[PDB]
Amino acid sequence: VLSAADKGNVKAAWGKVGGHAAEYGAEALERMFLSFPTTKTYFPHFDLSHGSAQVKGHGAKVAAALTKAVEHLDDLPGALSELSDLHAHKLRVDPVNFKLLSHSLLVTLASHLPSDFTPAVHASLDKFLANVSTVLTSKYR
Amino acid sequence: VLSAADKGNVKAAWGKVGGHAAEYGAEALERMFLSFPTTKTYFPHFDLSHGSAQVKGHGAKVAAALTKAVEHLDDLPGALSELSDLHAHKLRVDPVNFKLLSHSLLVTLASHLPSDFTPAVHASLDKFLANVSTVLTSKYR
Amino acid sequence: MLTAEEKAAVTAFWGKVKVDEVGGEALGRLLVVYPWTQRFFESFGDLSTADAVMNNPKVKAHGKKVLDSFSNGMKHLDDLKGTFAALSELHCDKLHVDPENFKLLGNVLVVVLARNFGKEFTPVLQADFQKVVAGVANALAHRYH
Amino acid sequence: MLTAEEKAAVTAFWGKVKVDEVGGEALGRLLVVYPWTQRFFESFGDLSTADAVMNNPKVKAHGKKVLDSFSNGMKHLDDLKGTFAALSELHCDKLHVDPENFKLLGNVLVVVLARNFGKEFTPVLQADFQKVVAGVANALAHRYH
Ligand code: HEM
Ligand code: HEM
Ligand code: HEM
Ligand code: HEM
């Protein structure tokens, strides 16, 4: 449960992302792959080279799911249902990876929204991504 | 975010503890202090020696809180609100410490309920303790 | 790590441990309690239920291997680093197991020792063992550090 | 941990870094984003609000100190262990800082570098700095390891 203040911050930030959401999700993946090479082990079927269309494509999907969570900040568990199943139950992604992607996401946003990325916005998004991660790692059974 | 199966396992386990909750609370603290000395820094003015009436007393407080939690597995936030305020806002206990206490508590139970501490029970108690920790670390505000 | 004192305490107690038994239990509980670790043992067959895991022959056998590796480091408590070099290479370099998992297994082992020895597994004894699993975990994640 | 090409890249980017500004912002955001950390900076006064924090002079002050530490490490990318050995005993043995926090500060600094350099802070450059903050955190936590 995010505060209403937190929710306003998320909504506002994602608002400025707007139409670049898909490009930021792709950039976030690329940064994750480069910074934390072990994350690459979850995509052995992917072409992981700079500018790959698989990564670009997957990035659009990640952004879409984040948009959906933003538009449903009140029922994350509900909104991210099949995603928890996939990640926790089918892929069995190690919880540590979620922290790596969150970080990659914050670095991307800070870089594109310097003015808007205030200590306060930072804290809110941090909390948002954590919640997201929590939901995605709830169904390990 | 405990499945029905989890709640039944916790309720069952806590029921076996019965009237030893306080003693187990005390032994868990003792095991924590011994195994992870850094935790001792949060109790500046506590004789943390074996038999200290302060560890005893404190162990009884923790045990009470856990019982309260077990009786309110449907509303931990509401059940542990005052304690989140205390631990997070007031004491600013680093979140890693919750994991040390949780482990210490699992060691204690395992030691006293060998036949009841099945793999499934262990899994449920691990999730319960993590959920309790999540609430106590919720109001970092 | 361990003083001579602590070294002796731990060493003495280890001798009461049935590696076959405890090893299968520790590995089975790790897969059960932290299910994401199952991804590395997909090969081991049926891990679908708590029961499937705990009765898995491959789990019991692998568990034995693990505890054996534990037995050894107990013998080389001063150079865990070198004791575990080859394993650190398999786990990190080849498997890419996140080092936090090394800590999870060490803690599960401690829970298993507590369950099996009850009152014999004293706070002080536990404390000694925590130093050990900590040393084991560190030596294995060295290919990272 | 840093290839020669990586070291060069990092080395040249650093030249543009305004340690003073960056340092205060990094320490400030840490206190704001991970509040338990304020426990250690009790003596700084009001940390009550993001505003009180970001603008607190002890914070800004202490932040530049931290960055100065980074720079020196930047100067000895080969002996972070030796370079920080004194700070390690301090943070660990005296302050009792959980080493997970060393990682949090390193990540926060990366976010700050990104916010301040935008476009220039590439995935590749970022990757290079991640290696750097990891080496510093490791070096600070060895009094533990
Ligand atoms: C913020 C957290 C995350 C979100 C919102 C997210 C979102 C998604 C989405 C939307 C898909 C595609 C599912 C579909 O539409 O079929 C997916 C698949 C996948 N995700 Fe994530 N994900 C997250 C974190 C992670 C992490 C941390 C990892 C591992 C490093 C990961 C690994 C994968 C893999 C391996 C797939 C399947 C790829 C495929 O389609 O072949 N995800 N995720
Ligand atoms: C499951 C986790 C925990 C539970 C249920 C719990 C419960 C409690 C309770 C019931 C109290 C007493 C409140 C009162 O009535 O005054 C308390 C106080 C306290 N707790 Fe915890 N606690 C937990 C975790 C921790 C951890 C991990 C630490 C630090 C390592 C910690 C440090 C403290 C301190 C320092 C106090 C105040 C002692 C005093 O000055 O009297 N707690 N806790
Ligand atoms: C104290 C920590 C650990 C120790 C001492 C340990 C020890 C061992 C040993 C002795 C082997 C057998 C190598 C051989 O065939 O001779 C092994 C292999 C293996 N370990 Fe571990 N291990 C630890 C933790 C982990 C963790 C946490 C995971 C994953 C979550 C893991 C995954 C594996 C896998 C998948 C194999 C090999 C299976 C195969 O190749 O058939 N280990 N480990
Ligand atoms: C990359 C990680 C870090 C580096 C490089 C670093 C570096 C430093 C430096 C250079 C000082 C100044 C010492 C002096 O006055 O000579 C210092 C002091 C201090 N640091 Fe850090 N630090 C780091 C992380 C942390 C973290 C995570 C915390 C706590 C949350 C922390 C808490 C403190 C405190 C409380 C002091 C005051 C020392 C004193 O003057 O008594 N540090 N650190």
Short mmCIF file of C-alpha atoms in Angstrom, two decimals, chain D residues 18 21-22 30 37 48 90 109:
data_model
loop_
_atom_site.label_atom_id
_atom_site.label_comp_id
_atom_site.label_asym_id
_atom_site.label_seq_id
_atom_site.Cartn_x
_atom_site.Cartn_y
_atom_site.Cartn_z
CA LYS D 18 31.67 18.05 -9.39
CA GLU D 21 27.60 18.85 -5.59
CA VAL D 22 27.35 15.11 -6.38
CA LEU D 30 20.32 7.86 0.66
CA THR D 37 20.28 5.10 7.51
CA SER D 48 12.78 15.19 9.34
CA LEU D 90 35.78 2.55 10.96
CA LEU D 109 25.58 7.60 -6.43
#
